[PDB]
C-alpha cells in the first residue's frame, strides 16, 4: 500500500493548494476509484449525501441541475408550481458553509437558524412549500451573516466537504460551472484574500463557495479532447495525471490487489488459478506488465498518451478465458475505436503489421474491391493461438 498512500498524497496536497483537482488519464486507470477511495478515507462515510456527493457530467448536463434553475415542483396537494431549485453544487456548497458555521464558536451566528438550514439542506425528499419558503428565508439570513463575518473565522471552516465530478469533460464545463469559474479559486472562496460573493441570476440570491468544499474531477482523456478545455478554467484545477500502471499486472501485484477484500480460503483458490493462468503464459510473471507496456508505448508513438490502455481491465483476470474476454471486449474494440478502424496502424500496435492470414487478431479478407480496397476482419483466436499471438506482441 505504498503506492496508494502517495496517490492519496498528490490529491490531498493539491486540494489544499488549489481547492479543486482533476484526475486525468485514459479510461481504466482507476481515476474514479482513486477519487472515491480518497474521499471515503478523508470523509469517513461510505455513502454520498452528508459530507460528500457524487455527480457525473454528461452532454445534457446543465447549469440548472448543478447550480440553480426554475423547476416545476408540486405541492402537498400535488398542484404544479414553478420554484427555483438549488442544484447539486449549491446544495453541497451551502451544506459545507452551514456545517462549517456549526463549529464556529462565535457570538453572532444564530445556531438555531443555522441548524434549521442544515436540516433543510440535508433533507433528501423535495421540500414542502411551507418549508421551501423557510429554506429561502434561512439562506437569506445566511448570506446576511456571512457577508458581515470576517475572514479570520470564514477561512477556518473545519469539516471538509467533497464533490466527485466523474467524467467532467463529458459535460460543457464552462456552461455548467456558471459562476463557478470565478468562485472556485482558492483566493475567491469565503475567508479568502479576494473573497467574492456572487449574485446568481435565477434566484437573485448571494452565493460563494466555502473553503471547506473540494472538487475532484475525473477526465477520461480518450473520451474527450483535452485541447478543448478552457485555459482559464484550467487555471482553477490542479491536474493530476493518472497513467496506466502495468506494474499492477504482475502476478504478485495481481495477488496483492485481489486479496484485500476476500477471505483466506478463497485467497489460495484464487492463487492457484493465477498460478495456472501465468503458467500458460510461459511462466512469465511480468507477462501482463510487458504486454500492457508494449502496446501503450506503441499507442503513444502513433496516437496520444491519452489513448493508452488502462490497467483495470486485466486487473480481475485470473484465467486465460478471462484474458480472452478482456482482450476481445475491452482492448480490441477500444483499439479499433481509438484508431478509427485503421487496420495497418492497429496491427503495428499489435506487432502483426506485415503478418496476415495467420494467427493474428486482424485477418485480411482475400477479396479486394474494384478500387483496390482491402478489408481486414477481427479473428477470434482461442487456446494456444491466442497466447501465441499475445507473445508475438511482447517479442
Amino acid at each position: 500500500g505504498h503506492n496508494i498512500k502517495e496517490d492519496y498524497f498528490r490529491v490531498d496536497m493539491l486540494l489544499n493548494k488549489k481547492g479543486q483537482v482533476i484526475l486525468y488519464g485514459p479510461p481504466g486507470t482507476g481515476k474514479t476509484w482513486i477519487a472515491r477511495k480518497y474521499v471515503v478515507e478523508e470523509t469517513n462515510e461510505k455513502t454520498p449525501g452528508n459530507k460528500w456527493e457524487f455527480i457525473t457530467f454528461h452532454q445534457s448536463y446543465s447549469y440548472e441541475e448543478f447550480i440553480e434553475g426554475f423547476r416545476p415542483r408540486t405541492d402537498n396537494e400535488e398542484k404544479i408550481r414553478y420554484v427555483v431549485e438549488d442544484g447539486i453544487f449549491k446544495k453541497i456548497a451551502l451544506r459545507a458553509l452551514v456545517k462549517g458555521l456549526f463549529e464556529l464558536e462565535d457570538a453572532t451566528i444564530g445556531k438555531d437558524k443555522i441548524h434549521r438550514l442544515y436540516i433543510l439542506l440535508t433533507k433528501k425528499e423535495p421540500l414542502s412549500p411551507t418549508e421551501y419558503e423557510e429554506y429561502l428565508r434561512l439562506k437569506r439570513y445566511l448570506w446576511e451573516l456571512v457577508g458581515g463575518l470576517p475572514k479570520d473565522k470564514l477561512k477556518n471552516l473545519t469539516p471538509k466537504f467533497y464533490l466527485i465530478i466523474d467524467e467532467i469533460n463529458r459535460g460543457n464545463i464552462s456552461k455548467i460551472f456558471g459562476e463557478l469559474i470565478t468562485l472556485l479559486e482558492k483566493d475567491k472562496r469565503l475567508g479568502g484574500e479576494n473573497q467574492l460573493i456572487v449574485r446568481l441570476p435565477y434566484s437573485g440570491e448571494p452565493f460563494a463557495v466555502p473553503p471547506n468544499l473540494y472538487i475532484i474531477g475525473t477526465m477520461n482523456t480518450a473520451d474527450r479532447s483535452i485541447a478543448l478545455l478552457d485555459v482559464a478554467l484550467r487555471r482553477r484545477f490542479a491536474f493530476i495525471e493518472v497513467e496506466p500502471r502495468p506494474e499492477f499486472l504482475e502476478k504478485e501485484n495481481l495477488k496483492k490487489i485481489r486479496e484485500k477484500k476476500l477471505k483466506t480460503e478463497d485467497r489460495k483458490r484464487l492463487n492457484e488459478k493465477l498460478n495456472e493462468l501465468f503458467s500458460k503464459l510461459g511462466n512469465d510473471n511480468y507477462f501482463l506488465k510487458t504486454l500492457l507496456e508494449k502496446i501503450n508505448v506503441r499507442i503513444t508513438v502513433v496516437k496520444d498518451r491519452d489513448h493508452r490502455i488502462g490497467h483495470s481491465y486485466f486487473l480481475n483476470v485470473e484465467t486465460v478465458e478471462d484474458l480472452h474476454h478482456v482482450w476481445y471486449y475491452e482492448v480490441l474494440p477500444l483499439l479499433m475505436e481509438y484508431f478509427y478502424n485503421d487496420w495497418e496502424t492497429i496491427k503495428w500496435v499489435l506487432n502483426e503489421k506485415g503478418k496476415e492470414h495467420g494467427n493474428v487478431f486482424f485477418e485480411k479478407l482475400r477479396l479486394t474491391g474494384p478500387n483496390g480496397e482491402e478489408a481486414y476482419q477481427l479473428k477470434v483466436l482461442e487456446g494456444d493461438a491466442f497466447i501465441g499471438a499475445l507473445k508475438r506482441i511482447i517479442s
Binding site: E64, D304, Y340
Partner: protein
C-alpha cells in the same frame, strides 16, 4: 503507387514499382473524370478544346501502352491505390525543393494564405514529397490551430419544451397550455451549439482525409481533430454544403481551413493548368516590383522577352527584375 511527375515527363510502367494495369486504369478513370469536369476548369490559351480531345486518353496525362506522358495540368491526383502528382518542369532539378516552390507559386498567385513556417515544418521531417499530404497537412494544421484557439460554436434560436426555464419564456405558447401540460416550459433559447454546418463540413473533411492520408504526421494531426469533432453529426460533403457557409466576424478565422477543405473535397484531386497558373502569377508580380510558358514574360530557373528568375524554391528575385524594369519603364 505514388507517381511523381513533371510536365511532359514520360515514365513507363516498368519504371514505376507497381502493377502493369492498376496504374493504368486508375488514372484512366481520372482523366475521363477530368474530361467531365473540364468545362469548369479554367484555361488561358492552353489550346486544349477538349470536347472529345481528352476522351482519347489526353486529359491530365497521356495513357500510352508503354509510358505516361504528362501535360500542362499541374496538381495532385489520388485514385484507386495510385497517387499521381504533376509539377511544373520549371522547378525540375538537375527532393522537397520542387514541391514547396509549387506550393509557394499557388500561394502568392492563387490567393491562399499558406504560411511559410508550416512549409518549413515539413522540411526536415524526412517524409515523402507528396502534394496531397502537404495540402492534407496544411488543412489539418490550420484547422487544429483554430480549434485549439477556439472551438467553433454558433448561436441558433431554438424553440424547446424544457424542464428548466432557460432563456426567454415563450409567453403565447406557455399561456395557451392546458393545465395538464404545465410540467415543462415553452422557451426560446439562443444556445452555443457545436453541431454547426461549418463543423459538419470540417468533420466530414477530416473523415475523408484519414481515408486517404499516408503520413503518420497527418494521421496524428487528423486523429486529434477527429476526437475534437466527436459529437458532430456526420454528413456527406456536397457542393451544396460548401456554399451555405457565409463568413462574418463569427467564423472568418475558420476561412483558411475552409478554403483548404474546399480545395481538397467537394476519384478526386486538384488540377490547374500551368499556362494559366503563370497568367495569374505575373499579374501579382508586376504590381509590387514597380505570358507564354515554353522555354524560348516567361519563366527562368536552373533548368529553364522578360525572364523571371526563381529564388522561390527556398523576395530578392524581383530585385533582379529592376534591370528589366529600367528598360521597360
Amino acid at each position: 503507387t505514388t507517381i511523381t511527375l513533371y510536365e511532359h515527363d514520360e515514365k513507363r510502367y516498368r519504371d514505376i514499382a507497381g502493377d502493369k494495369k492498376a496504374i493504368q486504369d486508375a488514372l484512366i478513370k481520372l482523366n475521363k473524370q477530368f474530361k467531365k469536369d473540364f468545362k469548369k476548369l479554367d484555361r488561358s490559351e492552353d489550346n486544349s478544346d477538349t470536347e472529345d480531345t481528352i476522351d482519347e486518353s489526353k486529359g491530365v496525362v497521356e495513357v500510352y501502352a508503354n509510358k505516361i506522358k504528362a501535360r500542362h495540368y499541374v496538381g495532385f491526383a489520388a485514385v484507386d491505390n495510385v497517387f499521381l502528382q504533376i509539377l511544373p518542369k520549371v522547378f525540375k532539378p538537375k527532393t522537397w525543393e520542387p514541391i514547396l516552390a509549387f506550393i509557394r507559386m499557388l500561394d502568392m498567385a492563387y490567393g491562399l494564405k499558406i504560411k511559410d513556417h508550416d512549409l518549413a515544418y515539413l522540411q526536415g521531417r524526412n517524409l515523402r514529397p507528396n502534394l496531397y499530404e502537404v495540402f492534407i497537412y496544411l488543412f489539418a494544421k490550420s484547422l487544429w490551430s483554430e480549434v485549439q484557439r477556439g472551438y467553433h460554436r454558433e448561436y441558433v434560436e431554438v424553440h424547446r419544451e424544457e424542464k428548466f426555464l432557460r432563456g426567454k419564456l415563450l409567453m403565447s405558447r406557455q399561456i395557451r397550455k392546458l393545465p395538464h401540460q404545465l410540467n415543462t416550459f415553452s422557451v426560446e433559447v439562443h444556445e452555443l451549439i457545436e453541431d454547426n454546418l461549418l463543423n459538419r463540413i470540417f468533420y466530414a473533411s477530416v473523415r475523408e482525409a484519414l481515408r486517404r492520408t499516408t503520413w503518420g504526421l497527418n494521421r496524428k494531426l487528423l486523429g486529434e481533430l477527429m476526437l475534437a469533432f466527436d459529437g458532430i453529426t456526420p454528413i456527406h460533403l456536397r457542393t451544396e454544403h460548401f456554399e451555405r457557409v457565409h463568413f462574418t466576424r463569427l467564423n472568418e478565422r475558420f476561412r483558411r481551413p475552409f478554403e483548404l477543405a474546399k480545395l481538397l473535397f467537394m476519384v478526386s484531386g486538384f488540377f490547374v493548368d500551368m499556362n494559366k497558373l503563370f497568367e495569374r502569377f505575373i499579374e501579382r508580380v508586376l504590381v509590387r516590383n514597380l505570358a507564354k510558358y515554353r522555354e524560348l514574360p516567361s519563366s527562368s530557373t536552373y533548368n529553364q522577352a522578360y525572364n523571371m528568375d526563381y529564388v522561390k524554391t527556398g523576395f530578392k528575385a524581383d530585385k533582379n527584375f529592376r534591370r528589366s524594369l529600367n528598360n521597360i519603364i
